[PDB]
Amino acid sequence: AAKNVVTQFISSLSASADVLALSKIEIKLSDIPEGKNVAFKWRGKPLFVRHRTQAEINQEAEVDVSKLRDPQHDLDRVKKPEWVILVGVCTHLGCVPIANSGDFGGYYCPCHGSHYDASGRIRKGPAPYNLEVPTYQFVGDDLVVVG
Amino acid sequence: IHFGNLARVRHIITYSLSPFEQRAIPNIFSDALPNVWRRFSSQVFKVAPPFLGAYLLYSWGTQEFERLKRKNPADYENDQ
Amino acid sequence: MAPNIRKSHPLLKMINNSLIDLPAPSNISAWWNFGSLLAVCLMTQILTGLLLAMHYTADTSLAFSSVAHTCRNVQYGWLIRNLHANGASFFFICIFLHIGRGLYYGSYLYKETWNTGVILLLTLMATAFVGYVLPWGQMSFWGATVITNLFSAIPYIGHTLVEWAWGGFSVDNPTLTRFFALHFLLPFAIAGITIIHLTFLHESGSNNPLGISSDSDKIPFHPYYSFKDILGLTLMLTPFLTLALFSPNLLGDPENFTPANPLVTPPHIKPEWYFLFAYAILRSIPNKLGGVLALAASVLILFLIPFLHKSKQRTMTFRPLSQTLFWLLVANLLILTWIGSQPVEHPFIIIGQMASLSYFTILLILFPTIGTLENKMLNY
Amino acid sequence: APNIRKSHPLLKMINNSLIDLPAPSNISAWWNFGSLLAVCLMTQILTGLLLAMHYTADTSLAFSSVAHTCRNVQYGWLIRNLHANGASFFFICIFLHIGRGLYYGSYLYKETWNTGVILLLTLMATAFVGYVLPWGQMSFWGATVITNLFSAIPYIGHTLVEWAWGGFSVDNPTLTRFFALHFLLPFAIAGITIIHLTFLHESGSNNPLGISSDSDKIPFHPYYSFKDILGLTLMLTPFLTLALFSPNLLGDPENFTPANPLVTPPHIKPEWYFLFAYAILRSIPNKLGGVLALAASVLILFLIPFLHKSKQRTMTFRPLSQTLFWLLVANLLILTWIGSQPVEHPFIIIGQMASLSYFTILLILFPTIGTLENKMLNY
Amino acid sequence: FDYLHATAFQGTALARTVEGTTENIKHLTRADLASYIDTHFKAPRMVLAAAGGISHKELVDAARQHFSGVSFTYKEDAVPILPRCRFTGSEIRARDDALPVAHVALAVEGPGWADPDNVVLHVANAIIGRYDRTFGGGKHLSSRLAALAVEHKLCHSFQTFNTSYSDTGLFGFHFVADPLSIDDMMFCAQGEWMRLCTSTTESEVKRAKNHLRSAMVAQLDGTTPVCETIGSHLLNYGRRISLEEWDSRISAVDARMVRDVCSKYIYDKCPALAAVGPIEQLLDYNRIRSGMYWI
Amino acid sequence: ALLRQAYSALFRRTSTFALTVVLGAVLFERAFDQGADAIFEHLNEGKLWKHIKHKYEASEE
Numbered sequence A: 001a002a003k004n005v006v007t008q009f010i011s012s013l014s015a016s017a018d019v020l021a022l023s024k025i026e027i028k029l030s031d032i033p034e035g036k037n038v039a040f041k042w043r044g045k046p047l048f049v050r051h052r053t054q055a056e057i058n059q060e061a062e063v064d065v066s067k068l069r070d071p072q073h074d075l076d077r078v079k080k081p082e083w084v085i086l087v088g089v090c091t092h093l094g095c096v097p098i099a100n101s102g103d104f105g106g107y108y109c110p111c112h113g114s115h116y117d118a119s120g121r122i123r124k125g126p127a128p129y130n131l132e133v134p135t136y137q138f139v140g141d142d143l144v145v146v147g
Numbered sequence B: 001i002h003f004g005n006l007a008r009v010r011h012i013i014t015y016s017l018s019p020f021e022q023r024a025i026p027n028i029f030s031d032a033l034p035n036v037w038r039r040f041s042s043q044v045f046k047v048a049p050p051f052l053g054a055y056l057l058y059s060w061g062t063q064e065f066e067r068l069k070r071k072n073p074a075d076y077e078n079d080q
Numbered sequence C: 001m002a003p004n005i006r007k008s009h010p011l012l013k014m015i016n017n018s019l020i021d022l023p024a025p026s027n028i029s030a031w032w033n034f035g036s037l038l039a040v041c042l043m044t045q046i047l048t049g050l051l052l053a054m055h056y057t058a059d060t061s062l063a064f065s066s067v068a069h070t071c072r073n074v075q076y077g078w079l080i081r082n083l084h085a086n087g088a089s090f091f092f093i094c095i096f097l098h099i100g101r102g103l104y105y106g107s108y109l110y111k112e113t114w115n116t117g118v119i120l121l122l123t124l125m126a127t128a129f130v131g132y133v134l135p136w137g138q139m140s141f142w143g144a145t146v147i148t149n150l151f152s153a154i155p156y157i158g159h160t161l162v163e164w165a166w167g168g169f170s171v172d173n174p175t176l177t178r179f180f181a182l183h184f185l186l187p188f189a190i191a192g193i194t195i196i197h198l199t200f201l202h203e204s205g206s207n208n209p210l211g212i213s214s215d216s217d218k219i220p221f222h223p224y225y226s227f228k229d230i231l232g233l234t235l236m237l238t239p240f241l242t243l244a245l246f247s248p249n250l251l252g253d254p255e256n257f258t259p260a261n262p263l264v265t266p267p268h269i270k271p272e273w274y275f276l277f278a279y280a281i282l283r284s285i286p287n288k289l290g291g292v293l294a295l296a297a298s299v300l301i302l303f304l305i306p307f308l309h310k311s312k313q314r315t316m317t318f319r320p321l322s323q324t325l326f327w328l329l330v331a332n333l334l335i336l337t338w339i340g341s342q343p344v345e346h347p348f349i350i351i352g353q354m355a356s357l358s359y360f361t362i363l364l365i366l367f368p369t370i371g372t373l374e375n376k377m378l379n380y
Numbered sequence D: 001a002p003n004i005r006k007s008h009p010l011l012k013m014i015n016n017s018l019i020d021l022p023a024p025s026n027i028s029a030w031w032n033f034g035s036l037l038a039v040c041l042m043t044q045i046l047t048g049l050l051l052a053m054h055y056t057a058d059t060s061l062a063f064s065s066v067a068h069t070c071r072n073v074q075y076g077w078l079i080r081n082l083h084a085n086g087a088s089f090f091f092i093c094i095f096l097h098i099g100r101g102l103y104y105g106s107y108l109y110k111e112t113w114n115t116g117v118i119l120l121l122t123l124m125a126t127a128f129v130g131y132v133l134p135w136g137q138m139s140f141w142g143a144t145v146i147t148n149l150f151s152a153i154p155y156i157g158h159t160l161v162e163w164a165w166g167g168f169s170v171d172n173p174t175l176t177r178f179f180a181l182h183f184l185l186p187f188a189i190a191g192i193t194i195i196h197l198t199f200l201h202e203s204g205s206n207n208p209l210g211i212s213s214d215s216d217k218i219p220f221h222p223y224y225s226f227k228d229i230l231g232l233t234l235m236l237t238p239f240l241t242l243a244l245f246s247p248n249l250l251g252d253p254e255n256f257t258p259a260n261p262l263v264t265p266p267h268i269k270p271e272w273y274f275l276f277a278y279a280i281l282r283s284i285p286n287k288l289g290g291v292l293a294l295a296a297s298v299l300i301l302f303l304i305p306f307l308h309k310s311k312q313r314t315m316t317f318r319p320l321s322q323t324l325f326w327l328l329v330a331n332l333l334i335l336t337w338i339g340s341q342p343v344e345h346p347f348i349i350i351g352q353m354a355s356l357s358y359f360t361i362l363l364i365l366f367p368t369i370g371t372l373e374n375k376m377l378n379y
Numbered sequence E: 001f002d003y004l005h006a007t008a009f010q011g012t013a014l015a016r017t018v019e020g021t022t023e024n025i026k027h028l029t030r031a032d033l034a035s036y037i038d039t040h041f042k043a044p045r046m047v048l049a050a051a052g053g054i055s056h057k058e059l060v061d062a063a064r065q066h067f068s069g070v071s072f073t074y075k076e077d078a079v080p081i082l083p084r085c086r087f088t089g090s091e092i093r094a095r096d097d098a099l100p101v102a103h104v105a106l107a108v109e110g111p112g113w114a115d116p117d118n119v120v121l122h123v124a125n126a127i128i129g130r131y132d133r134t135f136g137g138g139k140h141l142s143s144r145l146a147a148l149a150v151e152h153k154l155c156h157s158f159q160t161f162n163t164s165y166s167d168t169g170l171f172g173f174h175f176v177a178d179p180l181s182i183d184d185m186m187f188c189a190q191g192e193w194m195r196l197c198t199s200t201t202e203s204e205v206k207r208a209k210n211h212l213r214s215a216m217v218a219q220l221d222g223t224t225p226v227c228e229t230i231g232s233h234l235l236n237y238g239r240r241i242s243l244e245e246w247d248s249r250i251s252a253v254d255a256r257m258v259r260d261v262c263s264k265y266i267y268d269k270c271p272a273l274a275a276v277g278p279i280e281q282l283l284d285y286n287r288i289r290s291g292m293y294w295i
Numbered sequence F: 001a002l003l004r005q006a007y008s009a010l011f012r013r014t015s016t017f018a019l020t021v022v023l024g025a026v027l028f029e030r031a032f033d034q035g036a037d038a039i040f041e042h043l044n045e046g047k048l049w050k051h052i053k054h055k056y057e058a059s060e061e
């Protein structure tokens, strides 16, 4: 009786049903063309889902900079070669980068600089880290769930 | 100190057994239940009567209130 | 020094002298259980209340919705709201039996203990009163409206006294926020006064059903009443868990599921059951000011109980006349509870006026009289 | 029992604590801050209650409700003013209260001392959750940075955080529970205080000389009843001056900008009374080590009574321990300064050394110098 | 001690006092007395013991002369097998507050003369020992209960006993204390009982054995105490146990054994309680009963 | 004798007693739950979602 009542009461402080409802987002890959960059909302903050032509999948696979400014290795958190999902938040003062031209083709943060390439790596700018990639599942194949 | 300075008692011997040497619920039908009736018997003529009389007031009060909702047909007996 | 560290340790000492080595009468009954019940019930209400408060929003535009969100989205939030709401009723059930015990077994002669008791009751009533407004339903708003609007019957000072308590010109958001703060605060006062309540008690120790000196036969609190109380706990806790987990919405007005609307008066504005007797006495006097006084007098009359004891014996065990007169009063309170739940029409009006009249008559006149009449039949 | 002051079970612990209570004849003004903390607690609770009666615990109404209180509630600007600055008066008095005990060996009242540390820890938690209530920028990001540390804990860490948050970030489920926590905790402080004083009345008060004061005890009233009130108005004048002339002197102006989870403030610093602990937190670059170093900075007070090696109780007749004490006090100032500054050279290495010496003085030098003193006393 | 037997062996023959009832003494007849003598004082149930400057052969000769004729039937030969006595976890409290000091005896059931565990129970009893306010040793006494009794002024006196009978016994303790020192005394006493079953060290029993050795030897100081031992050894053991043999049994006792034997007869057993005098501070069997487990 | 052995092996020593309580509770929970859920589900046959679940998934959609 004690174990249960305690268990129930402790549970009342963890995330509620409505909070849990906005933890999961799924992205239809059949709604993102090559030429435009589609970004959604997830957990209150922008979620970049970029589709690139072959001039980024190949030319930006050429990763330089001897000691990168943040431990980003493409054998880690990047699954698909034609897909890339990021947290649309700068790691400097936490603002959102625009996905037009910029410098390194990828993203540019209109606050303090910080030019991000196609892979979402930190280049010219004051940002202390790279970008951010969430913990997602991709077993859906036709769609990606960022649970 | 609350045990020791309570009362001056003399010439009283008490006997008791360990709980493990005796029954917890003994003589249910020979001693327990006959008293349960005795205790009910002694008090029920003090407890029940005002409660019984209270219910009567409730029963009348409710019925009378409901009766005052119904219409008196003698009101309209000459209405045309 | 002292041998063990149970009689020594200044923390474990009053833990020992209150719940372990504390001398108690050998023959106190189950009517002495409701003391420890109220204690546990208080700690239960505070805990369930804290858990609810961590999801509550004190605002007229979010109050109802936040409570609803708690029941619908918070894990077991439906249960914590369930336990806290019905637990408030368990509090009053135990406190009415706690009081009734003392009145029957002459426990009020512990005047300091008794007086701190009345104050504990008054704080409890105020606590449950302001907590009822928190969900901000129809019965919440209009219950708060009808009751607080009574203070304006006070001459001169009155109409200002109300608008100050409201923080405006009617019950609104300035009233809800301060009622939530008040509802959060008061139970801790109840906790504190309880410690004072028990302190005055430990001066003389507990009374017993016979009403005679129990120094000849005292037993340690543990294990005799430590076990007896826990039994009385689970015995009393089963009907209410049954109440809360089978018929949760049995006690309350369904009107409180309709969000507060200041432009629609509910047809029958009645309180919860534990206020019904007082509500009936309030409506006995048609005069607004007299009704307030009669309401206040209905509970404040407990302060006059110790000064209205005229019997040579403490309890009512050996007093058959005072016994039936006691049960008349208990039945009287039932009739009052019934009248309060009914509209202000015939015959409920005259029945209420008589029941409330007899209520004060029994306590003020007949109880000290019959007690005297008994003493002369005992040849004193 | 003749009078009803020694009899009345209510008036008798009122008598045996504030009237007839034997106190040492020579305790100084450093013994005033006990009763100051007591009054300051009752002051904070009252000003807090008055503020809470106008506060709305919601991320869409929190900032606005506090602003409404200052702008619309009669003297609401003052009650917010007193409660905010009163929280600082609490920490000023509690730092001097602690510093007194460390200097005059009052920690040897271990039960009294330990309940003291707990009172401090509850106070820090109380002021921490209260800071989130106005829901400004520094409120949110202060809550974000600190609570996000718990995720450094192995395995159980990431769940431990999201549970406390009630979500995936600091939001409305966090604000409502912090307000409930901020409402609750001061009453715990009140209760433990009664326990704190109970353990004290076992041995009575210590004195500057550190010797048996049974030879010269005086009644609390009127000697220290008057002395405390004097010490009250003496201390209450600078802070009323602070609150009624420079109200916004102590706090970050960033807290006037409503909380925005998409803009990180350039320099996320705490209030002044957390600055020393914040500096120690940032001394260790490792996130988990930083948390431990932070916890150790305050929990180290539990180890003070077991690190007493001197044959004499106080530091009055101990010149070596005296300067070493003032080194530690100056050490804490340097830590307070470092915490208010960005994580760059030379502030980084200065902070690492100041925080290193902080534990070194308490753990190593204080019991060592104390021993070295005893042999100079020929013991 | 009479009350202790009266409640420990309540409802049996051992519950009776040696002196008997007032009514019995009043009304006992010459026939009743002569009956007892003829029924009980019979040759096989008697032992002629002697000790001093006595030739054994000369003894049995004078014995052969005056200790007389043979029994005829088989009934008069056979030695009776007494009906068993039932122990009862119980208490008897004879309260008299006018009585200056209170007496308390607490005991569990013993093993009987035959059991070799009776040796260990005597070693254990030697550990706790005894005390009265004339013990010059004072606060420095080895006995823990005695030291606590001195430090806290717990009692006027306390003693431990292992009274053995044919098929049963009474392992326990008895103390005399002031009306307000009873509960603390009982507390410490039961604590040392648990300390026996739980914490007994080799160092403790190395002393206790030395005391018991010196005790049994002191028991035989003179002709009468030797004759008493001899007259009882035959009557209870069926033989004489030399001090040499006692030493062998005792010297084999170690701390691990004392713990086991005590845990067997003491731990979580419902004890028998006799309390006489101003006895308010000591109360409730349940509290005493809970003092029988976990040190 | 189960009673005698349950005493000496489990209930006698305070340490072994407490371990029985823990071990017994773990087993009781695992049993009481599955039993209670079973008694409740049978009393509501075909009424629960787990019963009507097969019509709209895991076979057809």
Ligand code: HEM
Pocket: C031, C032, C033, C034, C035, C036, C038, C039, C042, C095, C098, C099, C102, C105, C107, C108, C110, C113, C114, C116, C117, C118, C120, C121, C124, C190, C194, C197, C198, C201, C205, C206, C207, C208, C302
């Ligand atoms: C939150 C409210 C209360 C709590 C927690 C509480 C608690 C207790 C407890 C634990 C006891 C000892 C056990 C018992 O005698 O039942 C007790 C006794 C008593 N209480 Fe209360 N009580 C409360 C309310 C009241 C009220 C409302 C009254 C009177 C109007 C009262 C008057 C008394 C008296 C007279 C006794 C002594 C009973 C006796 O020994 O005969 N208390 N209380």
Ligand code: HEM
Pocket: C042, C045, C046, C047, C048, C049, C050, C052, C053, C054, C056, C067, C081, C084, C085, C088, C091, C124, C127, C128, C129, C131, C132, C133, C134, C135, C183, C184, C187, C190, C252
């Ligand atoms: C003796 C103690 C208490 C009593 C008698 C009491 C009584 C009540 C009552 C009658 C309600 C009305 C709920 C309903 O009918 O829907 C309520 C609601 C509420 N109470 Fe309490 N309460 C107590 C303690 C507390 C405490 C200590 C807290 C917070 C610290 C608290 C917080 C709340 C909250 C948030 C609600 C709104 C939830 C709801 O309306 O169901 N309560 N209380």
Ligand code: HEM
Pocket: D030, D031, D032, D033, D034, D035, D037, D038, D041, D094, D097, D098, D101, D104, D106, D107, D109, D112, D113, D115, D116, D117, D119, D120, D123, D189, D193, D196, D197, D200, D204, D205, D206, D207, D301
């Ligand atoms: C809300 C927090 C606190 C309150 C209300 C409080 C209250 C008091 C009071 C009234 C006294 C007696 C007057 C005096 O000696 O100054 C006292 C003494 C004392 N306090 Fe506190 N205190 C608090 C925090 C602390 C802390 C944080 C510590 C230690 C880390 C502590 C340890 C002590 C000690 C050791 C004494 C004895 C001083 C002596 O007699 O030499 N207290 N406290």
Ligand code: HEM
Pocket: D041, D044, D045, D046, D047, D048, D049, D051, D052, D053, D055, D066, D080, D083, D084, D087, D090, D123, D126, D127, D128, D130, D131, D132, D133, D134, D182, D183, D186, D189, D251
């Ligand atoms: C030792 C006791 C207390 C301490 C140390 C404390 C501390 C604080 C602090 C530091 C703030 C931040 C305000 C700001 O900087 O703008 C605050 C705000 C607040 N506190 Fe407290 N507080 C205490 C007691 C209470 C109590 C007892 C209550 C309510 C019952 C309360 C209610 C509030 C409210 C409503 C606010 C929001 C108003 C504001 O942000 O200015 N406080 N508190």
Ligand SMILES: CO/C=C(/C(=O)OC)c1ccccc1CSc1nc2cc(OC)ccc2s1
Pocket: C122, C125, C126, C127, C128, C129, C130, C132, C133, C139, C140, C142, C143, C144, C145, C146, C147, C269, C270, C271, C272, C273, C275, C278, C279
């Ligand atoms: C906010 O109103 C609360 C009511 C209620 O029953 O709360 C549980 C209520 C609802 C409808 C009609 C009337 C009421 C209250 S009747 C009442 N409320 C109180 C409150 C007191 O506190 C000291 C004392 C006496 C009384 S009598």
Ligand SMILES: CO/C=C(/C(=O)OC)c1ccccc1CSc1nc2cc(OC)ccc2s1
Pocket: D121, D122, D124, D125, D126, D127, D128, D129, D131, D132, D138, D139, D141, D142, D143, D144, D145, D146, D268, D269, D270, D271, D274, D277, D278
């Ligand atoms: C919600 O955050 C509150 C902060 C603050 O200073 O509150 C007064 C704050 C703001 C910015 C940066 C850091 C902080 C908190 S620093 C801190 N906060 C705490 C709280 C504790 O409670 C036990 C203990 C130690 C510490 S150290």
Ligand code: FES
Pocket: A090, A091, A092, A093, A094, A095, A109, A110, A111, A112, A113, A114, A125, A126, A127
């Ligand atoms: S916020 Fe993106 S660069 Fe500073």
